[PDB]
Amino acid sequence: APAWTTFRVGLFCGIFIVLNITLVLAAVFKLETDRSIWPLIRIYRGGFLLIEFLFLLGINTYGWRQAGVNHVLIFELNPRSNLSHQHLFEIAGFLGILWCLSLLACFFAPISVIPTYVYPLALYGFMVFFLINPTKTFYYKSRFWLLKLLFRVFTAPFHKVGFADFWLADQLNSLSVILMDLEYMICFYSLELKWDESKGLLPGVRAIVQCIPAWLRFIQCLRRYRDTKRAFPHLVNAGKYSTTFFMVTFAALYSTHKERGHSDTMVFFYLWIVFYIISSCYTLIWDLKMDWGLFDKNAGENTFLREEIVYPQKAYYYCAIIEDVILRFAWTIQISITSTTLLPHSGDIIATVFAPLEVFRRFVWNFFRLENEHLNNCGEFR
Template identity: 70%
Template sequence: MSVFPLFLLQPALAWTTFRVGLYCGFFIILAIAFILSGAVFVRFENIWPLVRIYRGGFLLIQFLFLLGINTYGWRQAGVNHVLIFEINPRNNLSHQHLFEIAGFLGVLWCLSILSCLYSDYTYLPMQINPLILYGFMLLFLINPFKTGYYKSRFWLLKLLFRVLTAPFHRVEFADFWLADQLNSLVFVLMDLEYLVCYYIFELQWSNSRGLLPRDQDSGGHVCHSYSYGLRAVIQCLPAWFRFVQCLRRYRDTKRAFPHLVNAGKYSTTFFVVTFAALYATHRGRSQETENI
């Protein structure tokens, strides 16, 4: 198999470089603006719902930016990541493209938070802003039209599907690389789960500042507990993907080391999460009994 030389990879256009600088500049300015605004507007409210709802998006954007740094480092070191990940060598994202996407999403993230903080002036309920932000990010990913890095998005979606269906096909390098990244991004999944839970169980839709409730106005602490079970399942999912990938690799190669050893390593996550959930649930019930 011929190896596509790194120097033939398509360089980023000057317009892409300009957009990277533009988005990064806007992000820095808007980040300073929302930090100062938060210090002024947030006084006696409970800030944690807002923090947890937006934290996952920020971590995802940060991941894209750091992936761009990794890509730059790989190319500088002569690592042919395009061949390793089986990406189309004539149509792939450079580090500048990743910086551009991260910068653009970062600007939207900052604007969404500022819109939350200034909801009294924009006449847009605070709780609508995260839905718009994450809805746009989801549409950007699954957009079926051939715009916005269509082939790269399709490659990512295909890879995600392979991770979700790991036991039923051969596992390649890109598959377990992405599953490993999901293990690192488990807080993103947990925060997205918290977003859904909060909007269903705790958010008071009649309150236009529902993401900054006062303690006495909060609708309970369902989403901070394991009481409804889904939280523990979400927390175990990334480890489960790697666990079944390791079992599939053992089935294909018949090598106990390292595949069964890795499977055992990832299986410990199930015990950690299970006992943490049991402990948290038991402690919560004990406190309720003492209060009674």
């Protein structure tokens, strides 16, 4: 940990703190709130979730290093080349600085003659320009590794599945708001935002892309079964993600039929609720029994846990075992609403509230998934 790295982490943290306080003060005072600020939130939500995700990844790396979780071999990373938690903190802080500057610029855009709607385009553009940059300048090894992993995950079950592929696929599974906001921005720029007015706020296509983080993980499990000849450990989760498929399909059908007004809509409404049950159990039980490795009968002196515990405090587990549940249902509803458009009111706000909560659920999922992989070696990755 170089001293300049810690200085940069602290610098970006302080700048981000003061800029966020300035942002909330400007929103309270300088924001008119009479020009549909919701598209602004729906555009910046992807960046906010990404920055939160990177910061929580830094926390996860610190937790693994302190708790003895040898994630270096698990991720198949080079032992002499790793991105320590301070680097993730620095990247998150820098991206947060850019995000806050963009938001502040958008709030009082008359600061410059450039239109109010050109700030996010730069930010995400800069974001993309930070991800793809051939010059070996800013974490070139890390960005190139991430690009290889992104290509391997996103394409198809054409590559042998290692730990990094599955893990990033799951991270994208818990971060679908990024893809949904990408589609929303594309629709905004294609149908609205005439480009003539300086106001960037203004006075079934989503359903299929909603399943992309799940389609990339269902075919991955199918490929794993094909290459491993083990029906249970892969086909059960294949069905688990098929439950997400069915949930999204029935949400879309229910929304369309409610718009059509047919009585059969009510039937489909029931057809939604039941799936909202099974998914919220299928994604829950499979997560608590064989994903984390808890509720084991051979719990020994412990309760609801396993006999090999490496975290300093046992209560940390139990909160999660509750917290995950409290958030798991909170995830399953979200996946529906953004793909349903059922609620003209109180839908977008609740999705925006729940999205960082689901990112937090995925953050706490890593803490125990990597612990289980370190000890149990679950998943057959060696």
